[PDB]
Ligand SMILES: NC(=O)c1ccc[n+]([C@@H]2O[C@H](COP(=O)([O-])OP(=O)([O-])OC[C@H]3O[C@@H](n4cnc5c(N)[nH+]cnc54)[C@H](O)[C@@H]3O)[C@@H](O)[C@H]2O)c1
Ligand SMILES: NC(=O)c1ccc[n+]([C@@H]2O[C@H](COP(=O)([O-])OP(=O)([O-])OC[C@H]3O[C@@H](n4cnc5c(N)[nH+]cnc54)[C@H](O)[C@@H]3O)[C@@H](O)[C@H]2O)c1
Ligand SMILES: OCc1c(F)c(F)c(F)c(F)c1F
Ligand SMILES: OCc1c(F)c(F)c(F)c(F)c1F
């Protein structure tokens with residue numbers, strides 16, 4: 169029995185920016201009221217985790233990062249009603265409290281209990297459940313999945329199908345659901361439309377999947393790494409373009425290709441310049457552009473508002489617009505029902521001990537998703 | 543009996559930026575194929591016409607400005623099918639050719655034959671119908687309503703009810719329709735919502751009318767001229783705020799007043815800083831902000847894209863999102879049926895010869911709309 173006791177386990181601690189993860193023993197406190205302790209089974213490597221390493225996504229350090237995962241409930245605190253010991257679960261980096269004005273809104277998903285806007289790196293109660301070498305360690309987005317065991321608030325966990333394969337469905341905790349929902353829920357891609365997707369990583373591939381599911385006629389993938397094109401075409405891109413191949417700026421190229429602008433564009437990289445390019449390539453009167461990539465901390469973009477005055481719509485979203493706790497179990501059931509595929513996103517499967525190697529595959533351009541297994 | 547002949551008439555010619563209009567004789571050529579010559583009856587003074595004088599809205603000079611008007615067809619060119627001599631008409635500063643990809647789209651209204659994006663100051667065939675002192679004079683937006691007679695392309699004119707009061711319905715040619723449609727069509731304001739309207743001129747008052755027609759529960763007007771507040775409350779504002787009264791930035795004030803941000807905000811001024819403030823004050827997860835004001839030429843704004851990534855929508859529109867030639871006659875029929883009021887917008891009436899006094903009233907802050915009568 170571990171229930172009610174401190175667990176000593178392995179975790180990947182990031183002590184300061186621009187350093188490898190350190191794989192060492194941490195102590196994980198038992199869950200308090202309304203908290204859940206989870207034994208991790210699989211976690212993905214998302215570019216957002218790398219941005220924490222880079223320092224472009226700011227969160228308190230030292231930290232246990234990781235937010236795209238799946239595991240099994242080890243124990244529950246007093247008052248927990250939505251999961252039990254032995255349940256398969258996905259932690260939710262966007263919580264769903266069900267009580268705030270956003271949770272009550274039909275189209276909101278960015279719950280006011282989130283730890284994204286103004287990150288504290290704690291549990292809801294303002295404290296940490298983690299220590300390492302006698303020092304308190306911060307949580308990340310109320311998830312912290314780069315650990316054999318984590319503790320999450322009940323509003324930050326969803327119970328999923330007992331038969332689901334956790335080394336695949338961990339992607340429903342971030343990159344699949346984000347990209348797919350950006351297309352089908354946030355943009356509301358229409359049948360017969362032309363879409364442009366900037367960035368052909370795991371999230372951008374998921375946007376392509378959604379555009380194809382929504383019946384887009386043309387899906388133009390855009391990436392500076394032409395090694396990404398073959399998989400983008402496998403999941404539905406009709407054409408791929410590398411901005412580096414052209415004398416003209418790519419917004420001009422895509423406007424020409426689409427006979428006057430695309431219906432829907434997506435920025436799935438995280439750069440200010442590509443957010444403005446993506447907006448500009450959508451048709452001036454009725455185009456929609458969705459920002460999915462996470463921009464660099466504290467930097468503003470510059471843009472001409474005439475792009476909007478002619479009729480364009482610009483919007484962004486976290487987690488594909490999905491209300492997290494309602495939607496994650498439904499997405500897992502849809503995957504079990506063969507409504508969408510996850511294998512095209514998974515290029516590498518490594519033991520958790522090879523986390524640094526996984527990040528080097530992402531940085532070098534080789535991987536889409538590496539799944540780490542515990 | 544003027545049909546096929548040059549007409550000599552008075553017009554207000556703008557020879558140079560930052561100068562009074564010159565009321566003097568012009569020559570108006572007869573209409574070519576698919577053109578309509580109109581005897582003007584009434585024209586409004588819109589801030590966009592003043593921005594031309596200021597040089598912040600660029601169009602070629604010398605010019606006959608004016609775009610918000612109503613008149614009576616004097617003659618038609620070869621091939622015209624949609625109006626006849628003696629019909630009451632409103633010139634359309636946004637055309638509706640009915641054939642381009644925008645005109646065919648269900649949402650779009652910014653027809654590709656517009657003269658707004660890259661203004662030439664000509665008719666569709668690239669020539670002018672106006673001479674003054676033996677020199678060619680530019681058109682403005684394909685309308686040029688500050689003249690006793692104008693010539694417009696058939697795609698830039700709508701036939702309206704024969705019993706229409708032209709001294710009121712001229713406002714359907716720009717300010718009323720723009721503001722009202724920005725609320726009801728572009729933003730799609732919902733019953734029970736909270737709205738913020740930045741700028742309480744004739745367009746912003748029309749936005750308030752639309753928000754109240756849509757059932758908003760709270761409509762907060764924002765203006766630095768507190769003399770604007772009484773009329774804003776008459777047409778539906780529930781409260782007004784003057785940014786100059788507050789130590790804190792008005793986005794923070796409006797976020798506090800709305801218990802975490804408004805549902806819908808509207809920028810109806812034309813300044814870069816209020817475009818960013820208006821986006822900021824809508825609720826971060828589900829808010830919508832609409833740009834209606836016309837920004838200063840060739841200037842970029844700076845903003846933090848995290849405002850969008852949390853879930854906000856930012857859009858703009860021309861002419862309230864209305865397909866112009868379909869919509870104008872319906873709006874006139876609705877006015878005739880008392881579905882909305884125009885009198886609250888009309889604060890002054892002057893003869894056309896007093897155009898410079900009408901512009902002085904707008905610049906002083908004293909008027910909403912002055913209507914000029916020919
Ligand atoms: N909104 C959310 O909820 C959410 C969720 C998941 C990820 N993200 C962000 O989404 C972005 C993509 O994540 P990911 O798919 O894991 O990353 P990724 O696998 O690194 O993919 C990014 C792709 O962009 C390509 N790229 C880089 N620079 C350019 C450029 N200038 N022009 C065109 N292509 C370029 C690059 O080659 C790569 O294939 C990151 O910014 C993440 O932080 C956001
Ligand atoms: N999108 C369109 O189709 C369209 C159509 C009509 C007008 N316009 C533009 O809409 C804008 C408003 O036109 P209008 O109603 O005729 O002008 P207006 O009558 O000048 O009203 C603008 C209001 O803004 C107020 N204002 C000025 N600066 C500020 C400030 N910093 N903060 C708060 N309030 C301030 C000002 O006191 C005035 O009451 C102008 O930019 C027009 O060019 C756009
Ligand atoms: O990849 C998902 C993700 C985000 F979308 C963010 F906006 C963020 F700040 C972050 F830390 C994160 F992990
Ligand atoms: O007031 C309507 C109006 C606009 F919305 C513009 F964008 C524009 F350039 C213009 F000249 C105009 F008159």
Ligand SMILES: [Zn+2]
Pocket residue numbers: 263264265266267268269270271279280281
């Ligand atoms: Zn909530």
Ligand SMILES: [Zn+2]
Pocket residue numbers: 214215216217235236342343
């Ligand atoms: Zn992620």
Ligand SMILES: [Zn+2]
Pocket residue numbers: 637638639640641642643644645653654655
């Ligand atoms: Zn058209």
Ligand SMILES: [Zn+2]
Pocket residue numbers: 588589590591609610716717
């Ligand atoms: Zn106007």
